[PDB]
Amino acid sequence: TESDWGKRCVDKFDIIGIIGEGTYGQVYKAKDKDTGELVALKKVRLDNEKEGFPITAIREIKILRQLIHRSVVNMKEIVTDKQDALDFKKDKGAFYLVFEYMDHDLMGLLESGLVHFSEDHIKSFMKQLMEGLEYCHKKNFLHRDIKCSNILLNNSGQIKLADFGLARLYNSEESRPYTNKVITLWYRPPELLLGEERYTPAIDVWSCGCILGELFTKKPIFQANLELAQLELISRLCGSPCPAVWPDVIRLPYFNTMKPKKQYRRRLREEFSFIPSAALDLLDHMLTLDPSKRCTAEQTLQSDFLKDVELSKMAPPDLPHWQDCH
Amino acid sequence: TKPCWYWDKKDLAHTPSQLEGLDPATEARYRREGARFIFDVGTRLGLHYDTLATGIIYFHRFYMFHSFKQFPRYVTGACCLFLAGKVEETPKKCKDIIKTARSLLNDVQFGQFGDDPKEEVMVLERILLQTIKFDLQVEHPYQFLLKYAKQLKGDKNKIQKLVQMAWTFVNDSLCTTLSLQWEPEIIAVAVMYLAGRLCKFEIQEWTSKPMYRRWWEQFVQDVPVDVLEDICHQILDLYSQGKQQMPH
Amino acid sequence: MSYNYVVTAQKPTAVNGCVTGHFTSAEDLNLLIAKNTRLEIYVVTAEGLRPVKEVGMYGKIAVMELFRPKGESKDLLFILTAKYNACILEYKQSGESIDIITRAHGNVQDRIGRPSETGIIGIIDPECRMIGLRLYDGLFKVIPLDRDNKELKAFNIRLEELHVIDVKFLYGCQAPTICFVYQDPQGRHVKTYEVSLREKEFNKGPWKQENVEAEASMVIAVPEPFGGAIIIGQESITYHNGDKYLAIAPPIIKQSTIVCHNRVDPNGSRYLLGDMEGRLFMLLLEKEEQMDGTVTLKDLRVELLGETSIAECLTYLDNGVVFVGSRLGDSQLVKLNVDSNEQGSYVVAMETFTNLGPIVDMCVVDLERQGQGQLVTCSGAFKEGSLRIIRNGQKLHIRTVPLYESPRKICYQEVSQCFGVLSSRIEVQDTSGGTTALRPSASTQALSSSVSSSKLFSSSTAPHETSFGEEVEVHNLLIIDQHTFEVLHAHQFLQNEYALSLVSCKLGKDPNTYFIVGTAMVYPEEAEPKQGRIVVFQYSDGKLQTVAEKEVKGAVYSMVEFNGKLLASINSTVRLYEWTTEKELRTECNHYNNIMALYLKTKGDFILVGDLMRSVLLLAYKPMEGNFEEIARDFNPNWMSAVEILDDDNFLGAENAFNLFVCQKDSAATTDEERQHLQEVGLFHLGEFVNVFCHGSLVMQNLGETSTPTQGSVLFGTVNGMIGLVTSLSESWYNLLLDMQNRLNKVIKSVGKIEHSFWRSFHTERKTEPATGFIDGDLIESFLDISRPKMQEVVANLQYDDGSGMKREATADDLIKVVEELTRIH
Ligand SMILES: CC(C)n1cnc2c(NCc3ccc(-c4ccccn4)cc3)nc(N3CCOCC3)nc21
């Protein structure tokens, strides 16, 4: 049946090439021999045998077989290398996680400078991302690695979230110790810069706000190399963490340690004054310092900016293809 | 989409183990020993109850596709617990599972691990994953015992006695093939039902529908008493054959 | 890691802007000409221009303006670089010693902002109270010109109008006032605001918004006699001052877009206008004085003067002399006469300044069997199209062969003693239903001619509608002789067929040498071409014979000969064809993992593919198997302009951001993943747009030439006419030259006080990295031009390595020899 994963062989796919390098193996583009569908194969190598099958892949299998949303990437099956016949110990062949093939990734489209986003294209982008983030948050899962490279958009204007290698369940009642450094420094939330370690789903919302701002400038907002410099850049824009706006900042491990140059005032609305009013309000609420005052995924979907977007009107981004040469 | 992980009691007469000449009593004994091995090892390691149960459900499922005569059970058990730890985010190093296994197992039993215990377990991970068809998410009677108990309102002390007694039954049902016959939701109800009969409690009074004598039907739709009694019979038989008596 | 050296063989020749004023002395009339990164200062004479000074700047010159604040004797110069480096400069001369003073400087980049579509705009107040900068959408940046602002500190005023086309500071206003044409969904409008340095905000401007032409392009601030502004469009020129609105719509300007403007008479009575077909107009402002003692504008008139080179910048000098600065063709001095000549023209060319124009493609060929090599470049566009033959002999000798149409690709075929050149000409839909060319060109002045009669797409059934006046490109293959450069033959391709790629080679066991062209069927409706041809021609006995044609399902962007087989890139696919004994192309193997295979290069059985957005990939042909294998890819994303192979392990690429990089095989076989990661080991901001990389050198090689430290030679051609050379170094030579750069940068004074390290930093809107793996040859070759005190200051405590001596001190005289040897490669 369709559900008997791990047995079908990777012979069934014609490998087109290597689309990218992942965490637990390389990612390849491939065509299914039977259907002609294009797939993306993530290679999982347990040959290292340091600690066996990688947990990053275990998370992505465990969670993505549970999550069924248009804006969440779909794992179709898990296939294997030709296994050694009647010799299970010597078998070092790897496993492949089959996904749908998405035409492009956001970082590539922006780094190459080949995308222009109108307000209406940003509306369709964010409604899908937040709707899928909402779906995940309603299911009590945190992504913990929202970057532009984990947002896949195909030319049809459909957005899908993808690298769940760091996803774990969140319980509001049961506070649990979690890994401090989770989201990429450019998109890292302020609380994790101070090391909350018991963070809320709001961490993902901060990353998406960073994307929201980035889509309006085409340049990431908080570009730093070190955790302190990042807190400085965030502070120059959002204001310095202080009990006046974040009463519990005093509870954070590095609060007294990582002071910014000044106690800056918030200028987010001034430095982003070129943004439409409905959007600017969304950015201000998503880039709120205190995670308990930062808006939820649902609240962004009930905003003037996203509330009245019809997903029938996908409005694909302006991707130049001809005349890019001349 | 998703695989079916529940069989009928009559089907257990045809596990690989049975067809290689193992009798029903022996396979049942092997299942109890392998599960209790998983439980005790993880308890020493400080593992969450869900992690222990997940390993057991993997273990029980595994020997629905393979024979106990070709796959030594304590190696299988150790592997299941090792994977369960990663699945449930309570990870342990394989060397630490082997260490605890050595303490709890006698020399003959630890012989199953062969000359290199850690390797034999790590190798089996490939087979385990293919056997469970990479369906790693598992639900356990515990969550439903607490979700349903939260909706009961009444004497704080009578309900807590019901829950703890039912909890002990859930732990004991893991040593049985019930995990492979009935969904966890039914198990949680069955253990509430059992604890109720023994404690002379009438659970319907604690529900929002106090004159609905089949109290469970608001929690688990379509469950006949036939099923709940079958489950209760199986759990109590484990207490009668063993020395232990009802928890009270 | 990898070590390489980049040197400029010919400086940028395109004129990007030109201004006039009194910069060198309050007395002299100056002409400042800006080429990319280069500033040329001239003094206006009665015969032409007297050069006085040239400086380089560590930045692309984006804004260039002269102004004279109260208290100064002479004009000061403002320059803003494309990296947002601002400075104010002064000319100072002490007898024979000429130097440029940096009076104020700073970087005006904002942490947050959207770069505007119409680019950086910089304007200065008529009272020189402030500098206006339009850098980002929705923001107006003000640098107030107070004496104390030596760092050029500035503030932003919120601008409601996000999409601004153009802005100027208006004349005759009680306060500083800006006039701008902006775009919103309701069309284009002209609006005015006032600028308050005290309040640091806009106040309501003198006159109301008026709706303007949809394609309103340029704003002219008219001087005091008639205060106001003129708005230039595609069809109409309009004047707006308060309630006065006048508009002229002469049919002559509708034909070609007007791109430049300049004031002839300071009163504002006459302005010059230029358009894309090179036509030069006079815009005459007709005066009406009122009995009130006031001067008003009676009418606007446009008069055609003649033809100039397609001009990026115009500036009127004196008498009848006008400087024509062209980026597409040669710049000029032309004289405007009061009386027309017998052809009706008032314009007569005086001097012609060489511009290698846009270098679309180029090849190196030893025409005279000299062992040297000459560079035949495809240069210029449209009517200024040309082929340029460049040879060394101390200055480069450049011959220009006018084509009068846009050249696209060039390749040399020795067997035929001729070149093949792809070209396109612009024709316009005419009343016959067909098209008519605006002027004769090479594709029409060929001795013999042909037109492909291919029936491949003949079935069509795709409706394409034509409106009178629309432009079309007509593509041709030109056979041009290597000695005379007579256009021997011109082959015209199918209607709507673009010629994209060209090779000359033999295939298989076929002894004939062919011209092969790859094409694309281009229809306005298509996002990406879905039809195309590979055509095999034979040039024999003065006639081009169509030998074979292969239909493809895309655009043949790039082709290259590959060990007797034809390697071609069709959109996503990279394909290898074999040439059969039946003289037809047969597909052997394909590679499909690409977005758009724009560029191809080969070496042995290795193929380097340049992609639209995925940078560079190293492929290989496995002959034992008859297919392709991906060896390694550059996973860092980049938009490619051209690529080249340096050696079996190092690969060179160019970015659309004016950046260069080198990728190398990781050469570490620990994991398969390491082997497949091409690692960028070289990063360098060139400052130019590289279109073509070509192996070769123009230096005479007698085998007796002292062996240079550098190994290898790659020449490259850019949009601004700049020609450069990339060559490799040993680890020892790099470290020496790199350590010397750091010493030179501390010693050499930069114009605008721009840090050299900043200038060469890799720069995209999203990234900025320090340069690596590249030696700036121009900094190294400037050591020979610094004064002796500075030379000895540079060599202090300098030590050599990895050579005859493990630690050897350097003297100033030792380096003079090394750098001189390095000057022999360019
Ligand atoms: C595995 C699954 C989640 N998946 C499904 N479709 C995609 C997907 N699709 C976007 C994508 C598509 C094409 C290319 C590409 C094309 C030609 C040459 C080189 N790369 C890159 C990214 N890109 C990624 N990531 C790209 C960056 O690395 C890591 C993988 N994963 C995906």
Residue for token pair 């720069």: C763
CATH class of residue range B1-137: mainly alpha
Query: Given CB atoms, is A271 within the 8 Å cutoff of chain C?
Result: yes
The widest CA-to-CA distance across chain A, in whole angstroms, is 69
Position A240: which residue type?
A: S
How many CB atoms are located within 10 Å of the residue C85 CB?
27
CA separation for the pair C492, C476 (Å, rounded): 4
A96 to chain B, closest Cα gap in Å = 12
Looking at the DSSP assignment, which residues form a beta bridge with residue C628?
C621
Of B228, B144, B246, B231, residue with least CA distance to B188: B144
Report CA(A221)–ligand 1 centroid distance (Å). Answer: 24
Q: Looking at the complex, does the CB of residue C764 fall below 8 Å from at least one CB of chain A?
A: yes
Q: Does residue A319 belong to any structural domain of this protein?
A: no
Does a structural domain hold residue A163? yes
Question: Which H or E run includes A33?
Answer: none
d(CA B186, CA B206): 19
Residue C341 sits in the same domain as residue C486: no
C522–A16 C-beta distance less than 8 A: no
DSSP symbol at A135: H
**Whole-angstrom Cα distance, residue B184 to residue B139?**
7
* B chain contacts of residue A95, beta-carbon cutoff 8 Å: 129
CB C124 within 8 Å of CB C131: yes
* Partner-chain contact A271 C767, CB within 8 Å: no
Last residue of a domain, one of C353, C371, C397: C353
Burial C701-734 (b: 16+ CB within 10 A, else e): eeeeeeebbbebbbbbbbbbbbbbbbbbbeeebb
| Dist. CA C710–CA C733, nearest whole Å | 9
Range of the domain at A294: 104-303
Q: Are residues C208 and C275 in the same domain?
A: yes
Instruction: Count the alpha carbons within 13 Å of C228 in the hemisphere toward its beta carbon.
Output: 20
CATH architecture of B138-248: Orthogonal Bundle (1.10)
| B196: three-class secondary structure by DSSP | helix
Cα dist. C332→A220, C75, C271, C310 in Å? Answer: 44, 25, 18, 10
Which residues have CB under 8 Å from C233's CB, separation 6+? C212, C213, C215, C216, C217
A37 is known to lie in a ligand binding site: no
Domain match, A64 and A118 both: no
What six digits make up the tokens of A114? 């080949």
The residue out of A38, A72, A100 marking a domain boundary is A100
Nearest to A219 among C635, C676, C766 (CB): C766
The amino acid at C765? E
Query: A149 CA to middle of ligand 1, Å?
Result: 9
The residue among C655, C784, C761, C768 whose CA lies nearest residue C59 is C761
How many contacts, defined by CB atoms under 8 Å, are there between A and B? 59
**What is the residue with the minimal CA distance to atom 25 of ligand 1?**
A20
Contact A3 B3 (CB under 8 A): yes
Q: What CATH code is carried by the domain that includes residue A171?
A: 1.10.510.10
- The Cα C192–Cα C183 span in angstroms is 14
The size of chain B, in residues, is 248
Alpha carbon of C549 to those of C507, C560, C579, C648, C650: distances in Å?
A: 14, 17, 12, 34, 36
Dist CA C685 CA C588 (whole Å): 40
Q: Which of B124, B31, B116 is nearest to B71 (CA)?
A: B124
**Residue C741, C-beta contacts closer than 8 angstroms, at least 6 positions apart:** C756, C775, C776, C779, C780
Closest residue by Cα to residue B177 from B141, B231, B130, B129: B231
CB count, 10 Å around CB of C289? 11
Query: Contacts of residue A140 in chain B, CB cutoff 8 Å?
Result: none
Which residues lie closer than 8 Å to A110 by C-beta, 6 or more apart? A148, A214, A218, C766
Mutate to test the interface with A, among B119, B129, B146 (most CBs of A within 10 A): B129
Question: What total number of domains does chain C contain?
Answer: 3
Q: Is residue A132 part of a domain?
A: yes
User: For residue C540, what are the CA distances in angstroms to C70, C166, C518, C544?
Assistant: 72, 55, 20, 6
Q: What 3-state DSSP class applies to C318?
A: strand
The rounded Å distance from CA A108 to ligand 1 centre is: 9
Q: How many CB atoms lie within 10 A of CB C606?
A: 15
| Shared-domain flag, residues A50 and A182 | no
**Could you tell me which of A3, A22, A25, A174 has the C-alpha nearest to residue A105?**
A22
- Tokens standing for A84? 């050694």
For residue C138, give the nearest of A20, A112, A274 by CB distance.
A274
8 Å CB contact between A65 and B2: yes
The answer to whether C306 touches C272, Cβ cutoff 8 Å, is no
Where do we find the tokens 């075929």?
A: C413
Q: How far apart are CA C21 and CA C89, in angstroms?
A: 14
> d(Cα C17, Cα C35) in Å, to the nearest integer?
7
Is C747 in contact with C792 (CB distance < 8 Å)?
A: no
Residue nearest to atom 9 of ligand 1 (CA): A102
Cβ contact (<8 Å) for B91 and A55?
Answer: yes
**Looking at the structure, do residues C334 and C384 belong to the same domain, yes or no?**
no
Is the Cβ–Cβ distance between C759 and C94 less than 8 Å? no
Domain boundary among A73, A100, A127: A100
Q: Which of A298, A281, A227, A221 is nearest to A257 (CA)?
A: A227
The tally of domains found in chain A comes to 2
Q: What is the DSSP letter of C244?
A: E
A137 shares its domain with A85: no
**Is the same domain home to C620 and C558?**
yes
C452 and C552 fall within a common domain = yes
CB contact under 8 A, A324 and C612: yes
Residues 6+ apart with CB under 8 A from C654: C640, C641, C642, C643, C660, C686, C689, C690, C693, C716
Residues in chain A closer than 8 A to B82 (CB atoms): 52
- Which amino acid makes up residue C326? S
Count chain A–chain C contacts defined by CB atoms under 8 A: 94
Sign of CA dihedral C778, C781, C785, C791: positive
Helices (H), C568-698: 672-675
Whether residue A325 is contained in a domain is answered as: no
Question: What is the tally of helices (H) and strands (E) in chain C?
Answer: 7, 62
- Do A52 and A187 lie in one domain? The reply is no
Distance CA A230, CA A268 (A): 16
Q: Which among A268, A270, A279, A271 is positioned nearest to A121, based on CA atoms? A: A279
Residue A19 Cα to ligand 1 midpoint, Å, equals 5
Find out whether C419 and C411 touch, Cβ atoms under 8 Å.
yes
Q: What CA–CA distances, in Å, run from C670 to A45, A98, B227, C366, C675?
A: 15, 26, 58, 46, 8
Report CA(C348)–ligand 1 centroid distance (Å): 59
Rounded to whole angstroms, how far apart are CA atoms A20 and A104? 11
Nearest to C596, CA basis, from C577, C573, C575, C617? C573
- Measured between CA atoms, the residue of chain C closest to residue A215 is C114
What is the distance in A from the centroid of ligand 1 to the CA of A103? 7
Kindly provide the b/e burial profile for residues B129-143, where b requires at least 16 CB atoms within 10 angstroms of the residue's own CB. Answer: bbbbbbbbebebbbe
Q: After which residues is chain A broken (C to N over 2.5 A)?
A: none
Q: Rounded to whole angstroms, how far apart are CA atoms B237 and C470?
A: 92
For residue C808, the domain's CATH number is 1.10.150.910
Instruction: Residue C174: give the domain boundaries.
Output: 4-353
Nearest to C285 by CA among C263, C308, C305, C252: C263
Which residues have CB under 8 Å from C43's CB, separation 6+? C24, C28, C29, C30, C31, C49, C50, C52
| CA atoms of A47 and A54, how far apart (whole Å) | 10
Between the alpha carbon of residue C415 and those of residues C421, C489, C516, C704, the distances in Å are: 16, 16, 15, 30
Give the experimental resolution in Å.
Answer: 3.4
Structural tokens at position C252: 């002559």
Give the span between the Cα atoms of C145 and C352, in whole angstroms. 38
Q: Are residues A245 and A292 in the same domain?
A: yes
Give me the residue from B86, B91, B137 closest to A65, CB to CB: B137
**Are residues C538 and C544 in contact, defined by beta-carbon separation less than 8 angstroms?**
yes
The answer to whether residues C48 and C86 belong to one domain is yes
CATH number, residue C64: 2.130.10.10
- Measured between beta carbons, which residues in chain A are less than 8 angstroms from residue C110? 271
Could you tell me if A115 and A206 lie in one domain?
yes
Interface chains of chain B (3 or more CB pairs under 8 Å)? A
Whether residues B86 and A65 touch (CB distance < 8 A) is answered with no
CA distance A30 to A27: 10
Q: How far apart are CA A202 and CA A20, in angstroms?
A: 29
Q: Which of B1, B126, B136 sits opposite A58 (nearest CB)?
A: B136
**Tokens for C466?**
């034509």
* C236-242: long-range contacts, CB 8 A cutoff, minimum separation 24: C237/C283, C237/C300, C237/C302, C238/C212, C238/C213, C239/C285, C239/C297, C239/C300, C240/C179, C240/C190, C240/C207, C240/C210, C241/C207, C241/C297, C242/C206, C242/C207
Chains A, C in contact: 3+ Cβ pairs under 8 A?
yes
Nearest CA to ligand 1 atom 27: A20
What residues does each domain of chain B span?
Answer: 1-137, 138-248
Distance CA A255, CA A259 (A): 7
Q: What are phi and psi of B51, to 5 degrees?
A: -65, -40
Q: Which residues of A are catalytic?
A: 145
Residue among A41, A74, A76, A105 to mutate when testing ligand 1 (max atoms within 8 A of CB) = A105
Looking at the fold, whether C161 and C297 belong to one and the same domain comes out as: yes
Note whether A169 and A138 are same-domain residues.
yes
Return the closest-CA partner of residue C618 out of C628, C629, C632.
C632
- Are residues A60 and A109 both part of a single domain? no
Q: Does residue A310 sit within a domain? A: no
Where is the domain boundary, A84, A100, A116? A100
A53 CA: distance to closest CA in chain B (Å): 8
Radius of gyration of chain A (CA): 21
- The neighbouring-strand residues paired with A203 are none
Nearest to B134 among A46, A52, A61 (CB): A61
Residues with CB under 6 A from ligand 1: A 19-20, 22, 27, 40, 42, 73, 99-102, 104-105, 108, 149, 152, 162; C 593-595, 614
Residues A228 and A95 in one domain: no
Q: How far from the centroid of its chain's Cα atoms is residue A68's Cα?
A: 16
The 8 Å CB, 24+ separation contacts for C389-394 are C390/C10, C390/C356, C390/C698, C390/C723, C391/C698, C392/C698, C392/C699, C392/C700
In angstroms, the CA C248 to CA C245 distance is: 10
Residue C759 DSSP one-character state: H
Query: What's the token pair of residue C58?
Result: 């560590």
Q: Please give the helix or strand (H or E) that residue A261 lies within, else none.
A: none
For chain A, the helix, strand and coil percentages under 3-state DSSP, each to the nearest 5:
30, 15, 55
**What CA–CA distances, in Å, run from B153 to B161, B168, C72, C200?**
14, 21, 91, 68
3-state secondary structure of C574: strand
Query: Is the same domain home to A168 and A277?
Result: yes
Query: The tokens of C796 are what?
Result: 């202090």
Q: Are residues A135 and A34 in the same domain?
A: no
Spatial separation of the C-alpha atoms in residues A90 and C13, rounded to whole Å: 67
In a domain, A181, yes or no: yes
Residue C801 contacts residue C735 (beta carbons within 8 Å): yes
Looking at residue C18, its amino acid is C
Q: Could you tell me if C13 and C740 are in contact, meaning their C-beta atoms sit under 8 angstroms apart?
A: no
Burial C410-430 (b: 16+ CB within 10 A, else e): bbbbeebebbbbbbbbbbebe
A103 in a labelled binding site = yes
Give the bridge partners for C398, in sequence order: C390
What one-character-per-residue DSSP string does B26-84 give? HHHHHHHHHHHHHHHHHHHHT--HHHHHHHHHHHHHHTTTS-TTTS-HHHHHHHHHHHH
Q: Give the C-alpha separation, A220 to A213, whole Å.
A: 8
Query: Quick check: A309 and A149 in contact, CB under 8 A?
Result: no
CATH number at residue A73: 3.30.200.20
Q: Are residues A43 and A126 in the same domain?
A: no
- Residues C379, C307 share a domain: no
d(CA B94, nearest CA chain A) in Å: 7
Nearest in space to C274 (alpha carbons), one of C221, C225, C334, C319:
C334
Examine the domain organization and report whether C440 and C406 are in the same domain.
yes
Position in ligand 1 atom list of the atom nearest CA A100: 5
**Taking Cα atoms as reference points, which of A102, A108, A104 lies closest to residue A76?**
A102
What phi and psi, each to the nearest 5 degrees, are found at residue B143?
A: -60, -35
Q: Residue C157 corresponds to which tokens in the numbers above?
A: 């005023």
Residues C233 and C269 in one domain: yes
Whole-angstrom distance, CA of residue A229 vs CA of residue A235? 10
Considering the domain architecture, whether residues C523 and C394 belong to the same structural domain is answered as: yes
In a domain, A119, yes or no: yes
Closest listed residue to residue C500, CA positions, set A325, A1, B227, A243? A325
Q: In the listed set C728, C745, C767, which residue is the last one of a domain according to the structure?
A: C728
Cross-chain residue pair C637–A221, CB shorter than 8 Å: no
Instruction: Count how many Cα atoms sit within 13 Å of the Cα of residue C329 in the half-sphere of its side chain.
Output: 25
Determine contact, residues C532/C587, Cβ cutoff 8 Å: no
Q: Tell if the CB–CB gap between B94 and A58 is shorter than 8 Å.
A: no
Q: What is the 3-state secondary structure (H, E, C) of C408-442?
A: EEEEEEHHHCEEEEEEEEEEEECCCCCEEECCCCC
Q: Do B1-137 and B138-248 have matching folds?
A: yes
Residue C773 has phi, psi (to 5 degrees) of 75, 10
Min Cα distance C165 → chain A (Å) is 16
Q: Are residues C348 and C456 in the same domain?
A: no
Contact B1 A3 (CB under 8 A): yes
Distance from CA of A104 to the nearest CA of C (A): 9
CA C2 to centroid of ligand 1, rounded, Å: 29
β-pairing verdict for C471-481 and C487-492: antiparallel
> What CA dihedral angle connects C308, C311, C313 and C318, to 10 degrees?
0
3-state DSSP: chain C helix, strand, coil percent, rounded to 5? 10, 50, 40
Beta pairing class for C4-10 and C17-21: unpaired
Helix (H, G, I), strand (E, B) or coil at A148: helix
